[PDB]
Design a protein around this ligand. Structure first.
Ligand SMILES: [Ca+2]
Ligand SMILES: [Ca+2]
Lengths: 142, 63, 145
């Protein structure tokens, strides 16, 4: 009963390419090599231990799910984020005037800080007063 | 007279419609802003997280 | 009828500065936003009872959950009103008369309110509007998300 969960389960399944139902340290090393993600030794132990909440050396799906959910639960699907930008760009321009979003994202809802809104600009304000927002979206769904 | 009295219900319902109209606009803007905020805040929190990098690499392979 | 989550959402939208308070001058607007339509008299009684210049969410919930009329609860009275104003017996009223009544009598609306209402209203070549269609717009238009 949720699209986030199904996506996390699909990912876990790809990471379980031995089909055992769990990820060992040995297996996680292989997964990182497969997908070309580089992690230094300290960061590897940290990431494994983050996922392996029971500390038994094996990451079960529910453990992975809990961890990914904690960090990603407030994200949405690509389509929902696209539509949310479309509120502020009713035509299909792919561009929103930076003074228009700024007042929206800084004043409405759970207001962003100027530094979060500045990091956001660091991604998608390619011109001087215009935000492309696809530069942000595509960094999450490449 | 009696006309002043009978139109008050029409005035009440008219105000209602105007406010519901204004509110749809304001709510659409706030809901959309919230989705964007939630997504930015999350991304900035996990962008350098190894599990994110791995998940992001796997995502195109998922149904 | 608005859920608790919808009532909170609405309140938060009105509470632009996020201090947990909304001006009493916006209580009518906030109630109306969620599909309840107090008359000026009714709203004034409610405001007087609150004896406050602002209200919080708990208050808004309490006020909103009272049996203030929804738009369908006003259909009969509205159609009776318009029928009593219907000179020709053809289901129409002149838009000019409608504007005058809304603006100059009773719980008079503002000019801005009247222009927003009339923007969505079809006027014939003799200046007539179908008042049941107008009532229908008031009752069914912009429903709860
Ligand atoms: Ca475990
Ligand atoms: Ca306030």
């Amino acid at each position: 009963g949720d699209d986030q969960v199904s996506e996390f389960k699909e990912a876990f399944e790809l990471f379980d390419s031995e089909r055992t139902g769990f990820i060992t340290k040995e297996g996680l090393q292989t997964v990182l090599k497969q997908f070309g993600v580089r992690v230094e030794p300290a960061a590897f132990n940290e990431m494994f231990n983050e996922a392996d909440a029971t500390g038994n050396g094996k990451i079960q799906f529910p453990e992975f799910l809990s961890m990914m959910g904690r960090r990603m639960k407030q994200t949405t699907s690509e389509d929902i984020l696209r539509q949310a930008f479309r509120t502020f760009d009713p035509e299909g321009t792919g561009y929103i005037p930076k003074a228009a979003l700024q007042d929206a994202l800084l004043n409405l809802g759970d207001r962003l800080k100027p530094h979060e809104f500045a990091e956001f600009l660091g991604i998608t304000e390619t011109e001087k007063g215009q935000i492309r927002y696809d530069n942000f979206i595509n960094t999450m769904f490449t | 007279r009696r006309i002043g009295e009978i139109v008050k219900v029409v005035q009440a319902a008219a105000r209602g419609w105007v406010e519901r109209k204004h509110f749809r606009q304001a709510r659409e803007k706030s809901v959309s802003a919230r989705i964007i905020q939630d997504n930015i805040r999350a991304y900035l929190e996990f962008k350098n997280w190894a599990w994110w990098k791995l998940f992001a690499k796997a995502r195109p392979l998922l149904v | 009828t608005a859920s608790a989550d919808q009532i909170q959402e609405c309140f938060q939208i009105f509470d632009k500065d996020n201090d947990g308070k909304v001006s009493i001058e916006e209580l009518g607007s906030a109630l109306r936003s969620l599909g309840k339509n107090p008359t000026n008299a009714e709203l004034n009684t409610i405001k007087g009872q609150l004896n406050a210049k602002e209200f919080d969410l708990a208050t808004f919930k309490t006020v909103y959950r009272k049996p203030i009329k929804t738009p369908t609860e006003q259909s009969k009275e509205m159609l009776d009103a318009f029928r009593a104003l219907d000179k020709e017996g053809n289901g129409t009223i002149q838009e000019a008369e409608l504007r005058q009544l809304l603006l100059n009598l009773g719980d008079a609306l503002t000019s801005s309110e009247v222009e927003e209402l009339m923007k969505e209203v079809s006027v014939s070549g003799d200046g007539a509007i179908n008042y049941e269609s107008f009532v229908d717009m008031l009752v069914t238009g912009y429903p709860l998300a």
